[PDB]
Amino acid sequence: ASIKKVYRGMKNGAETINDDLEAINSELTSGGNVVHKTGDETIAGKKTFTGNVEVNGSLTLPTKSWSGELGGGIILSLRKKGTTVEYSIGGEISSSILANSNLVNRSVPNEFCPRNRCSLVGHMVGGWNAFHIDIPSSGVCQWFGPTASSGTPRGTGTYPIDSA
Amino acid sequence: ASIKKVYRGMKNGAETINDDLEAINSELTSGGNVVHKTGDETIAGKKTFTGNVEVNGSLTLPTKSWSGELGGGIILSLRKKGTTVEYSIGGEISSSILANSNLVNRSVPNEFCPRNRCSLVGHMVGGWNAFHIDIPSSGVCQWFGPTASSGTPRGTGTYPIDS
Amino acid sequence: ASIKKVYRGMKNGAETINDDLEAINSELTSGGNVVHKTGDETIAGKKTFTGNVEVNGSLTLPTKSWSGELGGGIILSLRKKGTTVEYSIGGEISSSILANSNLVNRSVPNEFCPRNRCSLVGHMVGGWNAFHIDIPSSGVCQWFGPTASSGTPRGTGTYPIDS
Amino acid sequence: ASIKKVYRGMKNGAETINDDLEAINSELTSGGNVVHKTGDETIAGKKTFTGNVEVNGSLTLPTKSWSGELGGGIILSLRKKGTTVEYSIGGEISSSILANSNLVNRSVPNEFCPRNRCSLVGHMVGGWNAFHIDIPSSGVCQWFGPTASSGTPRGTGTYPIDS
Amino acid sequence: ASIKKVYRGMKNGAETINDDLEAINSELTSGGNVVHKTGDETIAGKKTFTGNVEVNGSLTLPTKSWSGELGGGIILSLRKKGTTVEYSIGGEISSSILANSNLVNRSVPNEFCPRNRCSLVGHMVGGWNAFHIDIPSSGVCQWFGPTASSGTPRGTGTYPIDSA
Amino acid sequence: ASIKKVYRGMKNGAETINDDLEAINSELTSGGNVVHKTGDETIAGKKTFTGNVEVNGSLTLPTKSWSGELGGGIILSLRKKGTTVEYSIGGEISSSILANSNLVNRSVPNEFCPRNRCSLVGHMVGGWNAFHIDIPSSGVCQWFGPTASSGTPRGTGTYPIDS
């Protein structure tokens, strides 16, 4: 709060003191550079909460979305939320994909690439068939399942982006 | 803080200022309408943190639980935590469920229903058998695996609700 | 703020009031026991936010990492983040693991152990083979797949710790 | 210890002499700036031991851990302890790794980097095949096996951090 | 040091003051509970050195030795020193050792066991052949060479004893 | 500390008492024969630590370096640190090295020699070929690969100095 100096032999002393006290008390209820119990405010700086935090409303985190056909007709839908990326496998296998082969049609952007190699467990529509796609630090996904030419790939979950 | 007005020719002014300064200083340490570094306090309003937030304790978010048999002895345990719902597949298959057929025993409530169709990858006890159940915006879960009459379904993970 | 008492007939009164006001005003901008809109600060106590919280930076939660060979050559990488534990299946199956048998090489620590039984769905490299590992409150993992002696286990996701 | 001056014509001399003797004697058993034969203590400075140092409990040095996929599915796990790095090679070759090629997915961080080129000898599961991976001071690891597109590389050992 | 009280009107004051100064001064050179720059001394407690510790003499850590025939004629010799185990592979393969098989004559004792699987690379005399032997935390060693029924396995190195 | 005698009828007593207290108090902070929690100090004698010794700075042991051409173009580089020797194999095979033959250009000096035969496993650049070189206590190294007349031998690790 902007306050005036109080000194000996001051003209309008009581007036100055009152205005200084009112300016300080105004910041105790609303505005200024102080966080309040009421009202919509913006907070800057590294805040460390040693105690337990409870949220009754909604917690908003930075969000970024991406979708593309990795290779052979497999479309992966990604959605970043803080330090966790939510994956969604979809589409239909059009061309024959070899076992332990790289998907070169579309590469995963660097902002979605994890530090450690993550495995995305999926299921093939029709039978008891299972598959997993590995995401390296580079971005070139690999089909770790057997040689397949046709089928429906499905699978939704989460994978970490940070490790060490 | 509740403060008294200071004016020229005020009776007992020294006490008035002292009481006003003490009332303000009391709110600087505890209570009032300001958030303190010490003590348990309740905060209201939209708080936008532009900086980095670090929590050493426990984070609490709105929680709601649901459990019920989807169809043919397949019980799904759901728990919502803000924008992410945790799923758990349990039970044992009693009746015959057709391939690419809808489970009509009990539907998933709207508060647990995602915007887009989510696939829940699971594993059958005994063999290398795998299955996935799709959750549409309607609520009626669909078995996307092949025709089965017996087996133990298992699978635990997380699925998004917004997108 | 450290403030001095104001009384009637006070020697050097003007200075005392000014110093008290300046000390209070200093705490309104930086330091003290109050939380500010700017600067790196540490907050203690149970804080309840009734409104909507928005984070633009990074949210940090208590983190603990663990890695070890559960049994038969299967190495599980666990990383705790608040109330959710992130799992990662890796390694190579060296010795024969029986169907519905307990993994006795290394047990999951109690701090990573969930309240309920969680199924971690995985995939075997080379075929359409799937498997799930159950983790109880004790820590002794169970291989619920068929009797396997060789193969590459893979799988990454998240599982709840509380119920 | 904090002592008081003793001098001729001093007031309450015997008390001051006694208080000083007690203050000094206290530090011969615990605290102050002296290292003792009991107690948990932090010691600063360059301590040069010209004799025999015998550790019966534990000797704990600075430790740091790191793991990453170097390239081609090869995973290197590291633990720095003092002036030595403990390594473990794992994973499985996923794609063609050309003879004498740099592994270009992830480099070894500078804090784990050696002063000179370190040749880490390894073995491929299921045959008599050996290879090596060089860690240069830059941390850009290099494969010195022949061209390989599959297999399971292994090897545990150490390399030094200074020269 | 053991000292006597000094007080006003004390009998034999100068002597007591001197005796105390001497008792205290004695412990600045040897004995008592103080660590000195000379002498053989035993030190209890957690001693954290934040600076540079330079050892010119010897550094002696907890040591233990063990040797045993793991199986198939393969002999492993170990020496634990602190948090590290020094190993040496010897003997001669006497019988058929199947690829990826457990060596089931003798296991490594728990006190020599690592926290994680340790891959000990070795070489067979007289050719270009390499192998490895895994020591898991259980101590049941495993042969990762191919099937072998003869030859001389060798290899010296170290493995660690703990992990976070 | 160097102190002076105190006695009945002494000349300049208060001064001597004070000088003594100051001389003694001085050594509780620095110098004399006491080890302190600060400062660069040299410590003689057998120091046996029964508790946990934690080094946050550096731990420096006796070090010595050596390199030489063992024979046939094979160069061995060594660094002794305490009871451990760090090695690095280099050079290029220049001439025919017979299977199981002694490398007779230069031996490892006695101060770098082990108590027992040490088998140093290595790899040849560009193929899957491995070898080993034995360092006996005499320091006359022995090649345990087959007969070789060319190639690039590599391998970094350690061996111990006593048994």
Which two three-digit tokens encode residue E82? Answer: 């602190």
Selected residue of D67, D92, D103, D150 to mutate for chain A interface (largest A Cβ count, 10 A): D67
- What resolution in angstroms does the PDB record give? 3.8
| Per-residue three-class SS string for chain B | CCCCCCCCCCCCHHHHHHHHHHHHHHHHHCCCCECECCCCEEECCCEEECCCEEECCCEECCEEEEEEECCCCEEEEEEEECCEEEEEEEECECCCECCCEECCCCCCCCCCCCCCCEEEEEEECCCCCEEEEEECCCCCCEECCCCECCECEEEEEEEECCC
d(C-alpha D93, C-alpha A144), whole Å: 12
What spatial distance separates the first Cα and last Cα of chain A, rounded to whole Å?
Answer: 44
Return phi, psi of residue A109, to 5°.
-60, 150
- Check F50 against E43: CB less than 8 A apart: yes
Selected residue of E20, E37, E42 to mutate for chain D interface (largest D Cβ count, 10 A): E20
Contact (CB, 8 A) for C91 and C124:
no
Diameter of chain F measured on Cα atoms: 94
Nearest CA among A62, A65, A63, A92 for reference residue A77: A65
Neighbour-count burial for D19-51, b at 16+ CB within 10 Å, e otherwise? ebbebbbebbbeebbbbbbebebebbbbbbbeb
- Check D54 against E45: CB less than 8 A apart: no
- Strand partners for D30: none
- Check B47 against A28: CB less than 8 A apart: no
DSSP one-letter code for F138: T
- HSE-up of F1 (CA within 13 Å, CB side)? 22
Nearest CA among F87, F134, F135 for reference residue F110: F135
d(C-alpha D36, C-alpha D55), whole Å: 16
Count H helices, E strands: chain E?
1, 11
DSSP string, E105-144: S-PPPGGG--SS-EEEEEEETTSS-EEEEEE-TT---EE-
Contact (CB, 8 A) for A78 and A106:
no
Q: Quick one: which H or E segment has residue C69?
A: strand C63-71
Measured between CA atoms, how close is C146 to chain B, in angstroms? Answer: 5
Chain C partners within 8 Å of E138 (Cβ): 105
Contact (CB, 8 A) for D69 and D62:
no
Chain A partners within 8 Å of D65 (Cβ): 164
d(C-alpha F109, C-alpha F90), whole Å: 18
The two beta strands, D74-81 and D84-91, are antiparallel
Return phi, psi of residue C20, to 5°.
-70, -40
d(C-alpha B48, C-alpha B51), whole Å: 9
CA atoms D136, D142, D145, D146: torsion sign? negative
Q: How was this structure determined?
A: X-ray
Which two three-digit tokens encode residue D67? Answer: 């793991």
Other C-beta atoms lying within 10 Å of the C-beta of residue C87: 22
d(C-alpha D5, C-alpha C162), whole Å: 64
Q: Which amino acid is at B37?
A: K
Measured between CA atoms, how close is A105 to chain C, in angstroms? Answer: 22
d(C-alpha A103, C-alpha A69), whole Å: 9
Which two three-digit tokens encode residue D82? Answer: 């003092």
Number of residues assigned to chain E: 164
Distances (CA, A) of C114 to A59, B158, C117, E77, F148: 25, 15, 7, 41, 59
Which two three-digit tokens encode residue B132? Answer: 């996935």
Nearest CA among D129, D88, D120, F148 for reference residue E130: D129
DSSP string, F20-83: HHHHHHHHTTSSTTB-BSSS-EEE-S-EEE-S-EEESS-EE--EEEEEEEEETTEEEEEEEETT
Chain D partners within 8 Å of C152 (Cβ): 92
The distance of Cα D33 from the centroid of its chain, to the nearest Å, equals: 27
d(C-alpha E137, C-alpha E134), whole Å: 10
d(C-alpha D151, C-alpha D93), whole Å: 5
Measured between CA atoms, the residue of chain F closest to residue D87 is F157
Contact (CB, 8 A) for F54 and D60:
yes
* Geometric angle at alpha carbon F96, from F91 and F101, rounded to 5°: 90
d(C-alpha D17, C-alpha F23), whole Å: 14
Measured between CA atoms, how close is F138 to chain D, in angstroms? Answer: 25
C79 three-state secondary structure: strand
d(C-alpha F163, C-alpha F5), whole Å: 54
CB under 8 Å to A50, separation ≥6 — which residues? B56, B57, C42, C43, C44
Contact (CB, 8 A) for B44 and B34:
no
